[PDB]
Scaffold this active site. Structure first.
Site, short mmCIF file in Angstrom:
data_model
loop_
_atom_site.label_atom_id
_atom_site.label_comp_id
_atom_site.label_asym_id
_atom_site.label_seq_id
_atom_site.Cartn_x
_atom_site.Cartn_y
_atom_site.Cartn_z
N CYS A 106 0.84 -1.17 0.00
CA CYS A 106 0.00 0.00 0.00
C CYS A 106 0.87 1.22 0.00
O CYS A 106 1.64 1.42 0.95
CB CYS A 106 -0.89 0.05 1.26
SG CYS A 106 -1.93 1.54 1.37
N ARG A 109 0.08 4.70 2.98
CA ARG A 109 0.15 4.41 4.40
C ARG A 109 0.50 5.61 5.26
O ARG A 109 0.40 5.50 6.48
CB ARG A 109 1.13 3.27 4.68
CG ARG A 109 0.56 1.89 4.37
CD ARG A 109 1.61 0.84 4.68
NE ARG A 109 2.52 0.63 3.55
CZ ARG A 109 3.67 -0.03 3.65
NH1 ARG A 109 4.04 -0.51 4.84
NH2 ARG A 109 4.45 -0.21 2.56
N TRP A 278 -9.06 6.19 -0.68
CA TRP A 278 -9.40 6.93 -1.89
C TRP A 278 -8.42 6.58 -3.01
O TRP A 278 -7.36 6.01 -2.77
CB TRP A 278 -9.41 8.44 -1.61
CG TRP A 278 -8.14 9.01 -1.03
CD1 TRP A 278 -6.96 9.27 -1.70
CD2 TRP A 278 -7.93 9.43 0.33
NE1 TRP A 278 -6.04 9.82 -0.83
CE2 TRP A 278 -6.60 9.93 0.41
CE3 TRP A 278 -8.73 9.42 1.49
CZ2 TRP A 278 -6.06 10.43 1.62
CZ3 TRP A 278 -8.20 9.92 2.68
CH2 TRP A 278 -6.87 10.43 2.73
N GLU A 283 -4.75 3.95 -10.84
CA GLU A 283 -5.53 2.73 -10.65
C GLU A 283 -6.68 2.67 -11.67
O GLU A 283 -6.89 1.65 -12.34
CB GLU A 283 -6.10 2.65 -9.25
CG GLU A 283 -5.08 2.65 -8.10
CD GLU A 283 -5.79 2.51 -6.76
OE1 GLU A 283 -6.23 1.38 -6.46
OE2 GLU A 283 -5.93 3.50 -6.02
C1 HEM Z 1 -6.32 6.65 2.02
C2 HEM Z 1 -5.75 6.50 0.84
C3 HEM Z 1 -5.13 5.20 0.28
C4 HEM Z 1 -4.39 5.19 -0.83
C5 HEM Z 1 -4.04 6.42 -1.69
C6 HEM Z 1 -4.00 3.81 -1.10
C7 HEM Z 1 -3.22 3.39 -2.14
C8 HEM Z 1 -3.10 2.08 -2.55
C9 HEM Z 1 -2.77 1.59 -3.88
C10 HEM Z 1 -2.51 2.46 -5.14
C11 HEM Z 1 -2.76 0.25 -3.84
C12 HEM Z 1 -2.50 -0.72 -5.02
C13 HEM Z 1 -3.92 -1.20 -5.38
C14 HEM Z 1 -3.95 -2.05 -6.62
O1 HEM Z 1 -3.04 -1.95 -7.49
O2 HEM Z 1 -4.90 -2.87 -6.75
C15 HEM Z 1 -3.05 -0.15 -2.49
C16 HEM Z 1 -3.10 -1.44 -2.03
C17 HEM Z 1 -3.42 -1.85 -0.75
N1 HEM Z 1 -3.88 -1.03 0.27
FE1 HEM Z 1 -3.96 1.03 0.24
N2 HEM Z 1 -4.52 3.01 -0.08
C18 HEM Z 1 -5.24 3.83 0.78
C19 HEM Z 1 -5.95 3.39 1.88
C20 HEM Z 1 -5.87 2.12 2.43
C21 HEM Z 1 -6.56 1.68 3.63
C22 HEM Z 1 -7.52 2.59 4.43
C23 HEM Z 1 -6.17 0.40 3.85
C24 HEM Z 1 -6.60 -0.54 4.98
C25 HEM Z 1 -7.16 -0.03 6.09
C26 HEM Z 1 -5.25 -0.01 2.80
C27 HEM Z 1 -4.61 -1.23 2.63
C28 HEM Z 1 -4.12 -1.74 1.43
C29 HEM Z 1 -3.81 -3.13 1.19
C30 HEM Z 1 -3.91 -4.30 2.22
C31 HEM Z 1 -3.33 -3.19 -0.25
C32 HEM Z 1 -2.90 -4.45 -1.03
C33 HEM Z 1 -4.21 -4.98 -1.63
C34 HEM Z 1 -3.95 -6.13 -2.57
O3 HEM Z 1 -2.94 -6.88 -2.38
O4 HEM Z 1 -4.76 -6.26 -3.53
N3 HEM Z 1 -5.11 1.05 1.95
N4 HEM Z 1 -3.25 0.99 -1.72
C1 LIG Z 2 -8.79 -0.30 -0.71
C2 LIG Z 2 -7.30 -0.60 -0.52
C3 LIG Z 2 -6.82 -1.85 -1.25
S1 LIG Z 2 -6.41 0.79 -1.10
C4 LIG Z 2 -7.47 2.18 -0.90
C5 LIG Z 2 -8.21 2.37 -2.18
C6 LIG Z 2 -7.56 2.37 -3.35
N1 LIG Z 2 -6.81 3.43 -3.64
N2 LIG Z 2 -7.70 1.32 -4.17
C7 LIG Z 2 -8.22 0.00 -3.83
C8 LIG Z 2 -8.06 -0.87 -5.08
C9 LIG Z 2 -8.93 -0.35 -6.23
C10 LIG Z 2 -8.56 -0.93 -7.61
N3 LIG Z 2 -7.13 -0.80 -7.88
C11 LIG Z 2 -9.33 -0.20 -8.70
O1 LIG Z 2 -8.70 0.50 -9.52
O2 LIG Z 2 -10.56 -0.29 -8.78
#
Ligand code: HEM
Ligand SMILES: CC(C)SCCC(=N)NCCC[C@H](N)C(=O)O
Ligand code: HEM
Ligand SMILES: CC(C)SCCC(=N)NCCC[C@H](N)C(=O)O
Ligand SMILES: C[C@H](O)[C@H](O)[C@H]1CNc2nc(N)[nH]c(=O)c2N1
Ligand SMILES: C[C@H](O)[C@H](O)[C@H]1CNc2nc(N)[nH]c(=O)c2N1
Ligand SMILES: [Zn+2]
Lengths: 407, 411
Positions: A106, A109, A278, A283
């Site tokens: 992520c 963070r 958000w 993405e």
């Molecule tokens: C608030 C703004 C946030 C941003 C800008 C953000 C950004 C991102 C991005 C760009 C990815 C890659 C997603 C993909 O390629 O499918 C990601 C993955 C991930 N995010 Fe965040 N995120 C946010 C909030 C959160 C929150 C609130 C959580 C949990 C409470 C979280 C946990 C994770 C996890 C566990 C992944 C890996 C998911 C996977 O393996 O498919 N994120 N995040």
């Molecule tokens: C929700 C957590 C995994 S990260 C916070 C939200 C987010 N930034 N993306 C979530 C994955 C969305 C997907 N890549 C899409 O383009 O639809």
């Protein structure tokens, strides 16, 4: 033991000690790196509980206090007796925030400590689940001023009474196979769409149809619910310079809400834990719109721009990609829906890494996921060495319920 | 044991058995992945096993495993090791070894080409002037007036580690960098320290933005000596843009021949510390990294200024826009001057075909995703979506410390 990471753009070197606290396994060995692979009892539970409570009590600066020792005894007593235990609200909030802190994939963070945790452990039915989820959606959306949130359903017990959201994200678009051989809508969701139909959903059979929720409570058969349309904030996609862009008929939803993962805290397993933040613009504009297995619109867009598509070396794909991504960011910004660009997001993550290094001794990060899917090397994360390792509490993958559920 | 890799765009799944032949270590453990870390004399005892694995591999490649010729060669190498402490490769084994080091190079996207490598044997070289001559010949052959041919030149192997052949340049052809008293850099900032060394050795620096550096060559553990590559052998390309007529006035050019000269080639336990090799450029090496890295020529602002993009907010994607235009320019310029270059779409597509063919015929293809995925437009190339396994096979190319850090000066 002590490991160095170097930034090759700034020459700044950081020392990682946090990895020594790591517990789970990476998939790699001394002979093979699996860095680019997508998916690489009572006796078991008490060490896990102890490990967690120890870090919790340390964090509130009360390590080895009477209150610390008393809680360890209470949890051990409860495990011995019930074969499981219940987290205090304070422990649940801490655990959820730290699962996000530990999420090596992520980039967002920097925000980890501002997570609104909704405790739904009192939920017993799919209708209750639906109520909790609508409230999560409305709270997080906040009329476009998005706020990070997680909603946590009851933990796993014997494993036959699992709470699950069958959807991969709370809000996604349907996919349908056409008599044409082509795909209508989102090809990533064809299989889940069919499961919805076989369970009774009447599909509008359009390009951008918000899927219904398929919710499973207490290991029961899952049930369908339509999210009230007025709670699903969507954005029409236009371009600040190209007036023809709107004619493509593109829209996306404002709230990214991953719903298919498992939250592990102190050995306890929360199989239903939808969470949301958000979007980073790439993405939607790079992955959702331009992947060949997704909406795959590069071809159509390049045609409207009248670029030379005769040869790959004109970089027509690259030109169209940039424009599509400009449009996504412009549209979200103009409708006042929170979105972050890849330059800003990766810049904040570098600042976050340095915070984590000085305040915590490190930050697990998976470079393959952290580097944006466009313009990699012009973002500062490209030049940053990262160490990837698994800390707990964590978010984990789990198999799709339809492969597992007993009907 | 079998390992599977999946392409998430095609659902094509491949099975790797080749990883079972991997001996060297990665840097990773079960508890940490070091996949993004840039850099993570032998005894007779350690030498004969290494020689043996290599010759078993060579003899299998030519369908002569267990032959009288295979067995006689093993015995001959064995006896030579116990007698002289080392051994000499036959020309055929050297060629096979150098080709296989390329085949095995997990960070190289250009490997579809591995079997077409011209190997120049420079093991009879004794002096720095000898080295210079060999290197000029390599440059002329590889350049081929714009129709680039892959080549490697192989100087004598390490003996006691006190008599090493080294090319001090990191690439045969590169531009000088000069740090100014006001802290700005003239030319290429990557080559500042090396330029300082050249100057101290007595190089007379022109002090411009694109001064081709002199070769600094060490033969037989002797102190290195300076030489100028004849300008007529150094093919260069002025950079212009197909639609933007002001692009030429940026004053940009680049050289056509990319030739890595600081790596070590290991074949059958033997160490070739000077083995310059060359292929041809993928456009993003120049347009993305050389021009647009903040720590390199850093031209993004100046290009975006000239394009009149909105520069006040990163979310206009002004940097991304300028980046594509520069990269179009580099490819256009090379193509117009008939100098070999490959775009990142073509190169990655060819790599996937190579990789699949390697799985079928060899049982695997070690690949480092972090390096293989291009530095722009990652996910619109097929490699982004391809799972890869990274492991280390010999023969191989390895990093080695910069020689100014280790050399014992004679004076
Ligand atoms: C608030 C703004 C946030 C941003 C800008 C953000 C950004 C991102 C991005 C760009 C990815 C890659 C997603 C993909 O390629 O499918 C990601 C993955 C991930 N995010 Fe965040 N995120 C946010 C909030 C959160 C929150 C609130 C959580 C949990 C409470 C979280 C946990 C994770 C996890 C566990 C992944 C890996 C998911 C996977 O393996 O498919 N994120 N995040
Ligand atoms: C929700 C957590 C995994 S990260 C916070 C939200 C987010 N930034 N993306 C979530 C994955 C969305 C997907 N890549 C899409 O383009 O639809
Ligand atoms: C024929 C055309 C070739 C192309 C298009 C090509 C392409 C590339 C590219 C783009 C890289 C990454 C370079 C960087 O980011 O600095 C690379 C790395 C590498 N290539 Fe190739 N290459 C070619 C030929 C060769 C040859 C002839 C050899 C050796 C015989 C070779 C061996 C390697 C090695 C060892 C690396 C890793 C370099 C390092 O770690 O710094 N390549 N190649
Ligand atoms: C020589 C092998 C490593 S690969 C064959 C040549 C090449 N395609 N690149 C070499 C590296 C050039 C460097 N990235 C530069 O931008 O100057
Ligand atoms: C095979 C490879 O691991 C896979 O395509 C990855 C690469 N990097 C990624 N990075 C992010 N942020 N999201 C992804 O889905 C992927 N996919
Ligand atoms: C830290 C990181 O590994 C480093 O910046 C790498 C990333 N990938 C790369 N990939 C290639 N081909 N060349 C490089 O120099 C780099 N740099
Ligand atoms: Zn690894």
């Amino acid at each position: 033991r002590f490991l160095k990471v170097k930034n090759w753009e700034t020459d700044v070197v950081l020392t990682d000690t946090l990895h020594l606290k790591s517990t789970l396994e990476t998939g790699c060995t001394e002979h093979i790196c699996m860095g680019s692979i997508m998916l690489p009892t009572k006796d078991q539970l008490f060490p896990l509980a102890k490990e967690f409570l120890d870090q919790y009590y340390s964090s509130i600066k009360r390590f080895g206090s009477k209150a610390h020792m008393d809680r360890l005894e209470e949890v051990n007593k409860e495990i011995e007796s019930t074969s499981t235990y219940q987290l205090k609200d304070t422990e649940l909030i801490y655990g959820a925030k730290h699962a996000w802190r530990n999420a090596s994939r992520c980039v967002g963070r920097i925000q980890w400590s501002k997570l609104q945790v909704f405790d739904a452990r009192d939920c017993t039915t799919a209708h209750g689940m639906f109520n909790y989820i609508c409230n999560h959606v409305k709270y997080a959306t906040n009329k476009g001023n998005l706020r990070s949130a997680i909603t946590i359903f009851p933990q796993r017990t014997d494993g036959k009474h699992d709470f699950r959201v069958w959807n991969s994200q709370l809000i996604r678009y349907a996919g349908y196979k056409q008599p044409d051989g082509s795909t209508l809508g989102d090809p990533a969701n064809v299989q889940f769409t069919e499961i919805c139909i076989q369970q009774g959903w009447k599909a509008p059979r359009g390009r951008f149809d918000v899927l219904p929720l398929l919710l499973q409570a207490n290991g029961n058969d899952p049930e369908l619910f339509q999210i009230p349309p007025e709670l699903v904030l969507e954005v029409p996609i236009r371009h600040p310079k190209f007036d023809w862009f709107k004619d493509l008929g593109l829209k996306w939803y404002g709230l990214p809400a991953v719903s298919n993962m498992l939250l592990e805290i102190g050995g306890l397993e929360f199989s239903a834990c939808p969470f949301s933040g958000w979007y980073m613009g790439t993405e939607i504009g790079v992955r959702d719109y331009c992947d060949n297995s997704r909406y795959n619109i590069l071809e159509e867009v390049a045609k409207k721009m009248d670029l030379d598509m005769r040869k790959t070396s004109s970089l027509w794909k690259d030109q169209a990609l940039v424009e599509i991504n400009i449009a996504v960011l412009y549209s979200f910004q103009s409708d006042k829906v929170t979105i972050v660009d890849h330059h800003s997001a990766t810049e904040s993550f570098i600042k976050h890494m340095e915070n984590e290094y000085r305040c915590r001794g490190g930050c697990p990060a998976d470079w393959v996921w952290i580097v944006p899917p466009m313009s990699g090397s012009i973002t500062p994360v490209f030049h940053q060495e990262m160490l990837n390792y698994r800390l707990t509490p964590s978010f984990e993958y789990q198999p799709d319920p339809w492969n597992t559920h007993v009907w």
